[PDB]
Every structure is written in C-alpha cells, then in structure tokens.
Symmetry: C3
Subunit: 32 residues, 3 copies
C-alpha cells in the first residue's frame, strides 16, 4: 500500500512548495 501514503507525501510536498513561495513573497515585502 506504498501507493496512497505516497499520495499523502505528495500532498505534503505540494503544500510545502506553495508555502515556500508565499514565504518568499513575504520575505521580499519585509526586507529593506
């Protein structure tokens, strides 16, 4: 049942990807 834990891992990886980009936007906006 390697297949569907793999789906959850990927759902996490995707959420992380989008969070990283949003963080980067905030980083730029707070910076000088």
């Amino acid at each position: 049942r390697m297949k569907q834990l793999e789906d959850k891992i990927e759902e996490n990886t995707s959420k992380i990807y989008h969070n990283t980009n949003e963080i980067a936007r905030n980083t730029k906006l707070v910076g000088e």
Copy 2:
C-alpha cells in the same frame, strides 16, 4: 509498518497546517 511512517507523515501535515496559518498572518500584515 505502514502505521508509524503514517505518524511521521501526519506530524508533517500538522506542521504544514500551522505554518500555512502563520504565513497567512504575515501576508495580511505585509499587505496594504
């Protein structure tokens, strides 16, 4: 041993959830 990798996946999902909410707070605070 599907059970405890599943625990780690969930520990990650939880950490992501809280990060997403904190990011959203920062997004609002940087915005106009």
Copy 3:
C-alpha cells in the same frame, strides 16, 4: 521499500524546518 519513502518524508521534514525558521524571521519583522 520503507526506506526511500522515508527519504522523501525526511526531505519534507527538512523543508518544513527551514520554512518554519524563515516564517519566524518574517513574524518578527512584521511585529511591533
């Protein structure tokens, strides 16, 4: 094949760790 899904879980955990620290930097910078 518990071993390499475990590698991906860890790649996620590491990405989360670094995101949490970057968020914390932004939180401090937006705060009063």
